[PDB]
């Protein structure tokens, strides 16, 4: 029993974190095989940040303008290139701790673990979701750029996020490991200013039932259309048939039809909790996916 | 910016997890140097668990009764003993990945990271607190026994918890790594209930400081209070007493924000008496009590390991 924000064990990613220096700037890089990946804004001065021309900034650099430190060891850079908004530094040592890995670009609503790092050294691990507005609500300070997000299903590290910047509202923006930003954002200090992830809230209500609580259910059902008309009034994302399909295994394990759980959520939005909690929370939680619930919860419902 | 429940990086601990088998039971062990530590209840059959005589049950066991697997490698058991509620298995191989470590017994209110493991394999990491009633609100399934909790203190893994059992209410009980239980619990399948829990006051204050650091200020007010008056309110609301030591421990956060602890205590007093009036703090509608003062400083200052 129990239900926690549960990250992946971080060791496989810890063994890949390095420090990258260009000029007076230091940030984190990801060392996989003989390549180090990092945000390309490492090549910018403070002045460069409003309207950088990365091609013009990069052409002026040699390999030896980049320093890479792995623990107490300097790695020699023997090539460099830019792919979208990431810099790739070829180094003369392959990382012996490289895990089995892949790069995946995720969709809004998906979750991942973040290993927050400073100066190439891991500080902590926490769970995040890609918000509907393509930001993440991270916890990041000066020096955190190049920290990554990942999942480790089936003993393969799937890297899905690299941290690039904090927006004025205090939320976070970054890229996939091919250097393409999530959302409309750009690696420029220019103005570039969310909803609740409905499918995740439903998943978490299923978790609550699996773990033994049913107080929030009701005798009603809903059409999908009526559910969306109501939920959108509370700034919830539309629930699609794909979402309904993804909830199928949790529905089967609990005996609660997806549209019946939708009816329960409609009523929770109308009524509140009447002083109760669900899985320890007094608000509806939206950063657990259906897959995350199946990962963490028992396969047997506490009936 | 931002504030998350944050665990320590788990890699140093991952390299210590092994699988221990005794008869039909498999659970997790912690492999440090040439010793594997696990719950002593691994030696019990279901019948034994109802009223075990561990002295006698251990006498009936030999080295040959235990199997230890580290990944795909069998470690040969060459000695065994128990210390309190922990079984110690001496193995033929020292763990080459043994980190610098200590065994530390923590106090109620302190937090730690849990590496949840199954079949000797790490599955997930989360942050917990030792509750005032000496339980933890963990997340554990069948096979999780022997999972450990830890902090990293400077350069050193401080192991503080080993998981033994789930109580009827769904919360968790276990020992320090010297096998001493937290709380009035025993490693027997008999009726057991924790005391009514209370809220960890010093941690709530730490989290209000975190909220201020992160720009959430609506609950500040012109008032102060005394330690005596504050504790009358704490007691009324099922909060732990605030001691002068707690005030001292909050010193760095008080210094960083410029808000005296007793000033913040007046905020908390008003929140307890009036509720939040529909507002949230750091996204929560509850007063969060599983961040220590040090947890707030660690996260707000970017301490690495
Ligand atoms: C808090 C302002 N700083 C940052 O956002 C970042 C990134 N910044 C560039 C930046 C900045 C705003 C925008 Br819009 C675009 C761009 C892209 C050109 C340079 C300094 C490093 N830097 C950080 O170290 C950092 C990261 N995450 C959280 C925090 Cl508090 C700091
Ligand atoms: C859910 C019942 N199971 C458990 O509590 C434990 C421990 N149990 C013994 C037990 C049980 C309750 C008490 Br009181 C005392 C004792 C004597 C120590 C044996 C089976 C292994 N076992 C687990 O694998 C396990 C762990 N954490 C969460 C979950 Cl769901 C399971
Ligand atoms: Br996805
Ligand atoms: Br995968
Ligand atoms: Br909450
Ligand atoms: Na005040």
GROMACS .gro file of N, CA, C and O and ligand atoms in nm, chain A residues 25-27 41 44 48-50 52 54 118 139-145 163-168 170-173 181 185-192, chain B residues 1-2, ligand 1:
model
  187
   25UNK      N    1   3.134   3.035  -1.906
   25UNK     CA    2   3.010   2.964  -1.874
   25UNK      C    3   3.036   2.816  -1.848
   25UNK      O    4   3.099   2.748  -1.928
   26UNK      N    5   2.976   2.767  -1.740
   26UNK     CA    6   2.974   2.626  -1.709
   26UNK      C    7   2.828   2.580  -1.697
   26UNK      O    8   2.744   2.653  -1.644
   27UNK      N    9   2.799   2.463  -1.753
   27UNK     CA   10   2.670   2.398  -1.732
   27UNK      C   11   2.692   2.247  -1.744
   27UNK      O   12   2.805   2.200  -1.748
   41UNK      N   13   2.325   2.716  -2.591
   41UNK     CA   14   2.344   2.849  -2.535
   41UNK      C   15   2.470   2.858  -2.448
   41UNK      O   16   2.509   2.968  -2.408
   44UNK      N   17   2.698   3.131  -2.569
   44UNK     CA   18   2.656   3.271  -2.563
   44UNK      C   19   2.717   3.343  -2.443
   44UNK      O   20   2.714   3.292  -2.331
   48UNK      N   21   2.487   3.808  -2.577
   48UNK     CA   22   2.447   3.727  -2.690
   48UNK      C   23   2.304   3.676  -2.679
   48UNK      O   24   2.253   3.624  -2.778
   49UNK      N   25   2.238   3.690  -2.563
   49UNK     CA   26   2.120   3.612  -2.535
   49UNK      C   27   1.993   3.670  -2.599
   49UNK      O   28   1.900   3.594  -2.614
   50UNK      N   29   1.988   3.797  -2.640
   50UNK     CA   30   1.864   3.851  -2.695
   50UNK      C   31   1.841   3.805  -2.839
   50UNK      O   32   1.727   3.773  -2.878
   52UNK      N   33   2.096   3.590  -3.048
   52UNK     CA   34   2.217   3.517  -3.086
   52UNK      C   35   2.203   3.460  -3.226
   52UNK      O   36   2.097   3.412  -3.264
   54UNK      N   37   2.363   3.153  -3.369
   54UNK     CA   38   2.443   3.043  -3.319
   54UNK      C   39   2.545   2.997  -3.423
   54UNK      O   40   2.652   2.952  -3.386
  118UNK      N   41   2.431   2.025  -1.094
  118UNK     CA   42   2.505   2.150  -1.092
  118UNK      C   43   2.653   2.116  -1.107
  118UNK      O   44   2.703   2.027  -1.038
  139UNK      N   45   1.218   2.211  -1.054
  139UNK     CA   46   1.287   2.278  -0.945
  139UNK      C   47   1.432   2.290  -0.988
  139UNK      O   48   1.506   2.191  -0.989
  140UNK      N   49   1.469   2.410  -1.031
  140UNK     CA   50   1.597   2.434  -1.096
  140UNK      C   51   1.649   2.571  -1.056
  140UNK      O   52   1.575   2.669  -1.055
  141UNK      N   53   1.780   2.577  -1.031
  141UNK     CA   54   1.851   2.698  -0.993
  141UNK      C   55   1.955   2.732  -1.099
  141UNK      O   56   1.977   2.657  -1.194
  142UNK      N   57   2.020   2.847  -1.081
  142UNK     CA   58   2.136   2.883  -1.161
  142UNK      C   59   2.233   2.766  -1.168
  142UNK      O   60   2.268   2.707  -1.065
  143UNK      N   61   2.276   2.732  -1.290
  143UNK     CA   62   2.371   2.624  -1.311
  143UNK      C   63   2.308   2.490  -1.351
  143UNK      O   64   2.380   2.394  -1.376
  144UNK      N   65   2.175   2.483  -1.354
  144UNK     CA   66   2.103   2.358  -1.378
  144UNK      C   67   2.088   2.322  -1.526
  144UNK      O   68   2.045   2.212  -1.558
  145UNK      N   69   2.123   2.414  -1.618
  145UNK     CA   70   2.103   2.384  -1.758
  145UNK      C   71   2.179   2.258  -1.796
  145UNK      O   72   2.290   2.235  -1.748
  163UNK      N   73   1.724   2.041  -1.998
  163UNK     CA   74   1.680   2.169  -1.945
  163UNK      C   75   1.757   2.285  -2.009
  163UNK      O   76   1.881   2.287  -2.006
  164UNK      N   77   1.683   2.384  -2.061
  164UNK     CA   78   1.746   2.501  -2.121
  164UNK      C   79   1.721   2.631  -2.044
  164UNK      O   80   1.816   2.709  -2.034
  165UNK      N   81   1.599   2.661  -2.000
  165UNK     CA   82   1.579   2.790  -1.936
  165UNK      C   83   1.456   2.791  -1.846
  165UNK      O   84   1.369   2.705  -1.853
  166UNK      N   85   1.453   2.893  -1.761
  166UNK     CA   86   1.337   2.926  -1.681
  166UNK      C   87   1.269   3.048  -1.742
  166UNK      O   88   1.335   3.148  -1.769
  167UNK      N   89   1.137   3.036  -1.763
  167UNK     CA   90   1.056   3.145  -1.815
  167UNK      C   91   1.025   3.241  -1.701
  167UNK      O   92   1.034   3.207  -1.584
  168UNK      N   93   0.987   3.367  -1.732
  168UNK     CA   94   0.955   3.464  -1.627
  168UNK      C   95   0.853   3.421  -1.522
  168UNK      O   96   0.856   3.470  -1.410
  170UNK      N   97   0.841   3.130  -1.388
  170UNK     CA   98   0.906   3.039  -1.295
  170UNK      C   99   0.896   2.892  -1.337
  170UNK      O  100   0.947   2.805  -1.267
  171UNK      N  101   0.833   2.865  -1.451
  171UNK     CA  102   0.829   2.731  -1.507
  171UNK      C  103   0.942   2.717  -1.608
  171UNK      O  104   1.013   2.813  -1.637
  172UNK      N  105   0.959   2.594  -1.658
  172UNK     CA  106   1.082   2.553  -1.723
  172UNK      C  107   1.056   2.507  -1.865
  172UNK      O  108   0.953   2.447  -1.896
  173UNK      N  109   1.155   2.536  -1.952
  173UNK     CA  110   1.147   2.501  -2.092
  173UNK      C  111   1.276   2.432  -2.135
  173UNK      O  112   1.386   2.464  -2.087
  181UNK      N  113   1.295   2.209  -2.923
  181UNK     CA  114   1.217   2.255  -2.808
  181UNK      C  115   1.082   2.186  -2.803
  181UNK      O  116   1.018   2.159  -2.904
  185UNK      N  117   0.885   2.753  -2.781
  185UNK     CA  118   0.991   2.830  -2.718
  185UNK      C  119   1.119   2.827  -2.801
  185UNK      O  120   1.140   2.738  -2.883
  186UNK      N  121   1.202   2.928  -2.778
  186UNK     CA  122   1.327   2.948  -2.848
  186UNK      C  123   1.434   2.982  -2.746
  186UNK      O  124   1.407   3.039  -2.641
  187UNK      N  125   1.559   2.949  -2.780
  187UNK     CA  126   1.673   2.977  -2.694
  187UNK      C  127   1.725   3.119  -2.719
  187UNK      O  128   1.838   3.142  -2.765
  188UNK      N  129   1.637   3.214  -2.683
  188UNK     CA  130   1.660   3.357  -2.688
  188UNK      C  131   1.593   3.414  -2.565
  188UNK      O  132   1.484   3.371  -2.527
  189UNK      N  133   1.657   3.514  -2.503
  189UNK     CA  134   1.592   3.591  -2.398
  189UNK      C  135   1.503   3.694  -2.467
  189UNK      O  136   1.544   3.806  -2.490
  190UNK      N  137   1.386   3.650  -2.513
  190UNK     CA  138   1.283   3.734  -2.570
  190UNK      C  139   1.151   3.689  -2.506
  190UNK      O  140   1.143   3.579  -2.452
  191UNK      N  141   1.050   3.776  -2.506
  191UNK     CA  142   0.921   3.742  -2.450
  191UNK      C  143   0.864   3.622  -2.526
  191UNK      O  144   0.864   3.623  -2.649
  192UNK      N  145   0.821   3.520  -2.452
  192UNK     CA  146   0.760   3.400  -2.508
  192UNK      C  147   0.676   3.330  -2.402
  192UNK      O  148   0.696   3.213  -2.373
  304UNK      N  149   1.392   2.859  -0.982
  304UNK     CA  150   1.263   2.858  -0.909
  304UNK      C  151   1.203   2.718  -0.912
  304UNK      O  152   1.249   2.629  -0.983
  305UNK      N  153   1.095   2.703  -0.834
  305UNK     CA  154   1.021   2.578  -0.824
  305UNK      C  155   1.051   2.507  -0.693
  305UNK      O  156   1.151   2.535  -0.628
  609LIG     C1  157   1.686   3.228  -1.438
  609LIG     C2  158   1.743   3.270  -1.566
  609LIG     N1  159   1.838   3.173  -1.621
  609LIG     C3  160   1.798   3.076  -1.704
  609LIG     O1  161   1.682   3.063  -1.740
  609LIG     C4  162   1.904   2.981  -1.758
  609LIG     C5  163   1.929   3.010  -1.906
  609LIG     N2  164   1.976   3.146  -1.941
  609LIG     C6  165   1.936   3.172  -2.084
  609LIG     C7  166   1.791   3.206  -2.103
  609LIG     C8  167   1.716   3.262  -1.999
  609LIG     C9  168   1.583   3.294  -2.016
  609LIG    C10  169   1.524   3.270  -2.138
  609LIG    BR1  170   1.341   3.314  -2.163
  609LIG    C11  171   1.595   3.215  -2.243
  609LIG    C12  172   1.729   3.182  -2.227
  609LIG    C13  173   1.802   3.122  -2.345
  609LIG    C14  174   1.905   3.204  -2.414
  609LIG    C15  175   2.123   3.166  -1.922
  609LIG    C16  176   2.170   3.145  -1.781
  609LIG    C17  177   2.159   3.002  -1.729
  609LIG     N3  178   2.027   2.966  -1.677
  609LIG    C18  179   2.022   2.902  -1.558
  609LIG     O2  180   2.124   2.869  -1.499
  609LIG    C19  181   1.893   2.862  -1.493
  609LIG    C20  182   1.814   2.755  -1.534
  609LIG     N4  183   1.699   2.719  -1.475
  609LIG    C21  184   1.659   2.791  -1.370
  609LIG    C22  185   1.731   2.899  -1.322
  609LIG    CL1  186   1.674   2.988  -1.185
  609LIG    C23  187   1.849   2.936  -1.383
   0.00000   0.00000   0.00000
